[PDB]
């Protein structure tokens, strides 16, 4: 089986518009995202997408190229990007992003096109914050617990905020 059928459900027919949301006129799709710090970070989203399902290809966890996504749906999240697709379409998706006393440097993760009740944003349930292995810093690091809630900005918009609890040495 050749790889010419990658633009079969994509490409010319099958109604794959790269702007409209999955589950059209239907349920919201929640992203269970999680971060990784090195402020340069590396966020990755993952969500369910039954529209990108298949049956003629045997493997479930395949991988596509980072240049495949000029005709792929994105969330409209505003303030080097790869994607893989599972069997049902559990699309893991990341973008290489940088972000320029006990304090929280707050982050704000919202939608652009439409309000909350079709695009809900979340965290994940296990290990949503990740730290590097041997990170030394100029006596200014963060502690092990990072509490997670929403902020729910209104203009109704979603929010993914993290209390980066930290310390301060001498």
């Amino acid at each position, epitope marked *: 089986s050749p790889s010419d059928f990658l633009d079969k459900l994509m490409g010319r027919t099958s109604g794959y518009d790269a702007r409209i949301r999955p589950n059209f006129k239907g349920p*919201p799709v929640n992203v269970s995202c999680n971060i990784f710090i090195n402020v340069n970070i590396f966020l990755r989203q993952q969500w369910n997408d039954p529209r990108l399902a298949y049956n003629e290809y045997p493997d479930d966890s395949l991988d596509l190229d980072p240049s495949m996504l000029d005709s792929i749906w994105k969330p409209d999240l505003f303030f080097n990007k790869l994607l893989r697709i599972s069997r049902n379409g559990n699309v893991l998706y990341s973008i290489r992003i940088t972000l320029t006393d006990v304090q929280t440097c707050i982050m704000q993760l919202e939608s652009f096109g439409y309000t*909350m*009740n079709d695009l809900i944003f979340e965290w994940q349930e296990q290990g949503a914050v990740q730290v590097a292995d041997g990170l030394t810093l100029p006596q200014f690091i963060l502690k092990e617990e990072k509490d997670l809630r929403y902020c729910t900005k*209104h203009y*109704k918009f979603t929010c993914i905020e993290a209390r980066f609890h930290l310390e301060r040495q001498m």
Partner: antibody
Amino acid sequence: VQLQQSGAELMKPGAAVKISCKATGHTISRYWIDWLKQRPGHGLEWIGEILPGSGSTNYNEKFKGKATFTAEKSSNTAYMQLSSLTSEDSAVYYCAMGVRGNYFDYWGQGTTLTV
Amino acid sequence: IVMTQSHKFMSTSVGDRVSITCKASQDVSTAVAWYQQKPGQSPKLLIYWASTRHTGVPGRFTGSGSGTDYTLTISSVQAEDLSLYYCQQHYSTPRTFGGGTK
């Protein structure tokens, strides 16, 4: 986040209504507050909501003119104003502050009005 | 979207299941949150987004549904609430709250 509604009042047919929902814990100019007319016996339907900081509103077509609002920042309350009260004011008013969707989760203890 | 239920009351005891569905007409697929108001109290919710429950008293939640048919399984009952039930939707412009039963 807690809500504290005002007390009862006895008005005349054609008078005005002024109540307050005290919000202790957060700023009044942040979350949307919707007012629902909970009339027993009949059905329930959407009235219209405001943000008390920007004054943006979304009314119903059949409810224009009847529902008017008044915002205040330094009191942490939302003022509901009415006019031309008919004989169907027997309803309990609720400051329905649905924080995370078009549904509603945060409520008050009950604002009993009747004419 | 008109949302009402014909049947009103069902006789049961503690330990039996009760579940009465409804029939909508438009797409409210996962925008259903059936509420519950009691005399002397505030209108509370028993479900939101048709699948989950707010934290602090999670308790009694079990519900599903798709399209125009929506169920909410009330299986191992107790004797706190006795009133009249309903069916509703809150996605479109007509938003009713109804009541509730057991």
